[PDB]
Design a protein around this ligand. Structure first.
Ligand SMILES: Cc1cc2nc3c(=O)[nH]c(=O)nc-3n(C[C@H](O)[C@H](O)[C@H](O)COP(=O)(O)OP(=O)(O)OC[C@H]3O[C@@H](n4cnc5c(N)ncnc54)[C@H](O)[C@@H]3O)c2cc1C
Length: 449
């Protein structure tokens, strides 16, 4: 088939779909062309051994106002993650302590260094912002020092440094702290409202969508009907000043005035551009890369930890599993845990056989929540790294030095080609809410021209 549209959109993730949605409301015609046999991208609900699981993005925080509006508009409701009872902290010394409230049960010294580092991150985020962090007079010095070396410059206390790392390195960028800059940590902080919001799992991990985060794409895509094309990898974009022809598998050909690349930036060069994108894009794209995390799911006949008075929340910067949370489905009576193995720790796990990796991860959950954690009825690991249409998780970020050198160019159109994904977002950077903001921002740009 061949069609004409105002706008061809590559990818039916949140970002592409929100763009299409905003475009249609303005009266422009669209086609959304999607490689996979489904919409949603890095959001996906699936059933593994008869257990429904959220394989990808899923949590909504209170400052993600673009996503919260969108849910409302689509008739979707939220429920909150269970947080009653005590959380578990594992120290660098291997000590394991139950606690509630806002800081980790370390000694008073470490507690104070932590508070200091968190205040300093909040202050830099408030000054620098998420819209154009590379623009600030502090930017260059913060972008040429790794986050690790920055923590070293700020504090002699390793346990406080590792804990701060826990929330940004392993908990957001999913990269080790020696490999992104301090400016990138600040961006991540600014993008979520403040560093303190990232520290508090009651904020950043506040809510889930009844029916699963994937319903958001599924419902946007449904409203578009036949303008969504699945099982259609885009291969080729031919373009000039006044438009673009988009070529996809199954002999799809869309002639359009503008194209949106709604794909994460490590995937831009899966498509041939004719003529080639300019030098700046050739270079900039090579410097963007996804992190890596193993999202572990474990289903038990009851949420057993609630009986021992535990929330299900656990943190330990020294553990293979650095975080665990109650992830029980809305009105499920079966208990589900979610846990995260980040970056180089994920590499090490992936080198063990499937069976050794499971036992190792499970032995780690047991250290937080006791030996019942080792006998789940269902066990699963989200594997985004293997997916040719994603290739990592949660999201992409520049190598060290990239943010200030290329940040100004990451949203800039090339002729009729626009770029829209959470990985280039300002507020909501790397998250579903960032994908919505960018899709709407892109739509809004195309519409006013
Ligand atoms: C394990 C994991 C857990 C997460 N947890 C959180 C969380 O709880 N909350 C939060 O907000 N976010 C979370 N995220 C991040 C969030 O899901 C992403 O930020 C967001 O969904 C990205 O949306 P997107 O539209 O920008 O890109 P994507 O969802 O990646 O969509 C891009 C789409 O493009 C398609 N595509 C790529 N190339 C082509 C091509 N050449 N032709 C056609 N189609 C193509 C892909 O198949 C894909 O559907 C998580 C992500 C992962 C990976």
């Amino acid at each position: 088939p061949t069609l004409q549209r105002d706008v061809a959109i590559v990818g039916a993730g949140i970002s592409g779909l929100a763009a299409a949605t905003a475009l249609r409301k303005a009266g422009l015609s669209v086609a959304v062309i999607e490689a996979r046999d489904r919409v949603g991208g890095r959001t996906w609900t699936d059933t593994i051994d008869g257990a429904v699981l959220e394989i990808g993005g899923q949590w909504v925080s209170p400052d993600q106002t673009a996503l919260i509006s969108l849910l409302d508009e689509l008739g979707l409701k939220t429920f909150e993650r269970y947080r009653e009872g005590e959380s578990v902290y594992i120290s660098s010394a291997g000590e394991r302590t139950r606690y509630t409230g806002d800081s980790f049960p370390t000694n008073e010294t470490t507690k104070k260094e932590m508070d200091r580092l968190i205040d300093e991150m909040d202050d830099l985020a408030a000054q620098i912002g998420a819209e154009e962090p590379w623009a600030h007079p502090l930017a260059r010095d913060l972008d040429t020092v790794s986050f690790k070396q920055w923590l070293i410059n700020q504090s002699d206390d390793a346990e406080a440094r590792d804990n701060i790392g826990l929330f940004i390195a392993g908990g957001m960028l999913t990269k080790p702290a020696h490999s992104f800059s301090a400016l990138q940590a600040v961006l991540m902080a600014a993008s979520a409202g403040s560093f303190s919001h990232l520290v508090d799992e009651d904020f950043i991990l506040d809510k889930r969508v009844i029916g699963g985060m994937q319903q958001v794409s599924i419902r946007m895509a449904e409203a578009l009907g036949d303008d969504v094309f699945l099982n259609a990898p885009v291969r080729t974009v031919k373009w000039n000043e006044s438009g673009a022809t988009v070529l996809a598998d199954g002999d799809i050909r869309v002639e359009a005035s503008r194209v949106i690349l709604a794909v994460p930036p490590n995937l831009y060069s899966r498509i041939s551009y004719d003529p080639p994108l300019p030098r700046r894009q050739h270079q900039m794209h090579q410097h963007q890369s996804l992190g890596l995390v193993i999202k572990v799911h474990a289903v038990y006949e009851t949420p057993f930890w609630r009986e021992d008075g535990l929330s299900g929340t656990g943190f330990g910067a020294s553990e293979v599993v650095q975080e665990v949370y109650d992830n029980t489905n809305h009105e499920d009576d079966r208990g589900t845990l979610v846990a995260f193995v980040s970056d180089e720790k994920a590499d090490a796990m992936f080198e063990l056989s499937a069976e050794e990796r499971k036992a190792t991860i499970l032995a780690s959950l047991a250290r937080y929540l006791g030996p019942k954690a080792e006998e789940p009825v269902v066990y699963y690991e989200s594997d985004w790294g293997s997916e040719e249409w994603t290739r990592g998780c949660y999201a992409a970020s520049f190598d060290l030095g990239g943010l200030h050198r290329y940040g100004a160019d990451s949203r800039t159109p090339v002729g009729p080609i626009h770029f829209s994904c959470s990985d280039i977002a300002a507020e909501g950077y790397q998250h579903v809410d960032g994908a919505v903001r960018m899709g709407q921002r892109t739509a809004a740009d195309i519409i006013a021209r």
